[PDB]
Amino acid sequence: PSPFFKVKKLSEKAVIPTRGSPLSAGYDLSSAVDSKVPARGKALIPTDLSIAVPEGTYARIAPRSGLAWKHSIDVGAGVIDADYRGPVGVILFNHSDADFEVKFGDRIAQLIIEKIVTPDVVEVDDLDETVRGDGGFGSTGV
Amino acid sequence: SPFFKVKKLSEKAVIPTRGSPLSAGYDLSSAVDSKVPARGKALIPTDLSIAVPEGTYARIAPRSGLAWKHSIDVGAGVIDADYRGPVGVILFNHSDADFEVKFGDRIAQLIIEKIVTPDVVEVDDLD
Amino acid sequence: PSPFFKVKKLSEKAVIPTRGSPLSAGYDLSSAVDSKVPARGKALIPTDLSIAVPEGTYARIAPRSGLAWKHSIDVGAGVIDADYRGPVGVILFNHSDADFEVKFGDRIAQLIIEKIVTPDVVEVDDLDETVRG
Numbered sequence: 001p002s003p004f005f006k007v008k009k010l011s012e013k014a015v016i017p018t019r020g021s022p023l024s025a026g027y028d029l030s031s032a033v034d035s036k037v038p039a040r041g042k043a044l045i046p047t048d049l050s051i052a053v054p055e056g057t058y059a060r061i062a063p064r065s066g067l068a069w070k071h072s073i074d075v076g077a078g079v080i081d082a083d084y085r086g087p088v089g090v091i092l093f094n095h096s097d098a099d100f101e102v103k104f105g106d107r108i109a110q111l112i113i114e115k116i117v118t119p120d121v122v123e124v125d126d127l128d129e130t131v132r133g134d135g136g137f138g139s140t141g142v
Numbered sequence: 143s144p145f146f147k148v149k150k151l152s153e154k155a156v157i158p159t160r161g162s163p164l165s166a167g168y169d170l171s172s173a174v175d176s177k178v179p180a181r182g183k184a185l186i187p188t189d190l191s192i193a194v195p196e197g198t199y200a201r202i203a204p205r206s207g208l209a210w211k212h213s214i215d216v217g218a219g220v221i222d223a224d225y226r227g228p229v230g231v232i233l234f235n236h237s238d239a240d241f242e243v244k245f246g247d248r249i250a251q252l253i254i255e256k257i258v259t260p261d262v263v264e265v266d267d268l269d
Numbered sequence: 270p271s272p273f274f275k276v277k278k279l280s281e282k283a284v285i286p287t288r289g290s291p292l293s294a295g296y297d298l299s300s301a302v303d304s305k306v307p308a309r310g311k312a313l314i315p316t317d318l319s320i321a322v323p324e325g326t327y328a329r330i331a332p333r334s335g336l337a338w339k340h341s342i343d344v345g346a347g348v349i350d351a352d353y354r355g356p357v358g359v360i361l362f363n364h365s366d367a368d369f370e371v372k373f374g375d376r377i378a379q380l381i382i383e384k385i386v387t388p389d390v391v392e393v394d395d396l397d398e399t400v401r402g
């Protein structure tokens with residue numbers, strides 16, 4: 001079917017998520033509360049939204065660039081399942097030594113509806129061999 | 143058809159399971175006890191090797207409970223479709239509280255993300 | 270429509286992104302500068318690239334595992350819109366007590382062209398119910 005993104009407001013403070021540029025990846029999420037993210041700490045910021053996205057996708061809470069370089073803010077967790085109908089919370093980590101203030105309505109993250117596959121796991125005794133093989137953790141160099 | 147092939151590397155390994163019916167992720171279990179030091183990191187073995195299809199990769203993604211309760215985040219996390227080595231999970235501990243992972247704990251979730259991998263075309267103008 | 274990944278060098282310090290293995294998810298990104306990511310701090314590292322990827326995708330700047338494990342480096346931000354035509358910057362956090370040196374040409378992140386959907390958002394009074402838990 002056609003993809004969709006449906007949102008239900010859980011309070012008046014909720015804000016409809018907002019696209020950026022026309023080919024933009026995400027929908028900006030706004031805080032439904034006044035809060036803060038403590039220096040070198042974390043916070044759970046409610047959006048007061050419940051959402052629905054299609055089977056074969058999930059909604060990823062992803063970081064905004066401005067907040068990253070200006071405030072050292074990153075998004076923790078962030079995997080919203082397509083069948084999750086509870087309140088959507090944004091987990092922020094503050095990797096700086098100053099508290100980050102959040103006012104209600106402030107755009108604190110961006111939601112991206114990522115395409116995925118979910119096949120049944122097939123357990124095998126052997127896998128195919130490749131060029132990469134067991135190479136990882138810097139095997140291709142600096 | 144998409145696939146997710148999993149090879150157990152030891153009897154400590156657990157076949158990943160999805161936590162809910164339409165869930166994005168297959169939960170990954172730790173094959174060891176391990177300390178994740180405050181403001182530090184740990185590399186946790188799953189004792190699994192995997193294969194996913196060309197046109198996808200396996201992303202090691204953070205679980206919400208570990209993040210919210212324990213300030214745990216997943217570093218790195220890009221498992222290439224051609225990687226046949228052991229899948230390892232990098233955890234960062236973004237708190238001043240030392241934390242301990244126990245054998246069998248679900249410490250991350252694997253998501254098989256759809257991607258494209260075209261050959262790069264260099265241009266002087268992008269549109 | 271066939272996917273593409275168009276790249277424009279903004280300087281001679283830019284490097285065309287390359288796949289680290291034949292079926293790699295990502296294209297490695299090189300620093301166009303000598304810089305550093307301070308201990309417990311951050312840096313924006315220019316690539317001197319502008320890029321374009323298709324509608325229905327975005328370019329994700331993602332962390333390399335070697336740098337993550339050896340140097341506690343992680344990638345912040347990282348969402349490059351398919352219609353973004355400015356310079357592509359890599360935002361790095363350093364989660365260790367040791368400064369991390371960046372030399373020009375060092376591969377400091379990887380770019381993954383992730384498939385997405387971008388439907389028009391709609392507010393509803395009631396969502397469809399699901400059996401969860």
Ligand SMILES: O=c1ccn([C@H]2C[C@H](O)[C@@H](COP(=O)(O)NP(=O)(O)OP(=O)(O)O)O2)c(=O)[nH]1
Pocket residue numbers: 061076077078079080081084087088089090091161204205206207208
């Ligand atoms: O950042 C987040 C992450 C998750 N969530 C919600 C939606 C998601 O479908 C649901 C479960 O998230 P995780 O699977 O990542 N957390 P965990 O595995 O610890 O809990 P559970 O056992 O319920 O799956 O929590 C948020 O609201 N914000």
Ligand SMILES: O=c1ccn([C@H]2C[C@H](O)[C@@H](COP(=O)(O)NP(=O)(O)OP(=O)(O)O)O2)c(=O)[nH]1
Pocket residue numbers: 135136137138139140141202217218219220221222223225228229230231232289332333334335336379
């Ligand atoms: O979290 C991770 C990340 C990577 N890996 C493995 C699988 C992956 O295909 C391989 C290489 O990952 P990256 O390309 O993201 N890191 P890096 O570029 O430093 O390693 P390499 O030079 O080998 O490509 O390491 C893990 O086991 N866990």
Ligand SMILES: O=c1ccn([C@H]2C[C@H](O)[C@@H](COP(=O)(O)NP(=O)(O)OP(=O)(O)O)O2)c(=O)[nH]1
Pocket residue numbers: 020063064065066067110330345346347348349350353356357358359360
């Ligand atoms: O890591 C990044 C992230 C973004 N960017 C560029 C490309 C992206 O399309 C553009 C905007 O990214 P964000 O939406 O994450 N930033 P923000 O929401 O703060 O600002 P804007 O008003 O431009 O959307 O900045 C980078 O170069 N590196």
Ligand SMILES: [Mg+2]
Pocket residue numbers: 020064110
């Ligand atoms: Mg934006």
Ligand SMILES: [Mg+2]
Pocket residue numbers: 161205206251
């Ligand atoms: Mg879960």
Ligand SMILES: [Mg+2]
Pocket residue numbers: 140289333379
């Ligand atoms: Mg690599």
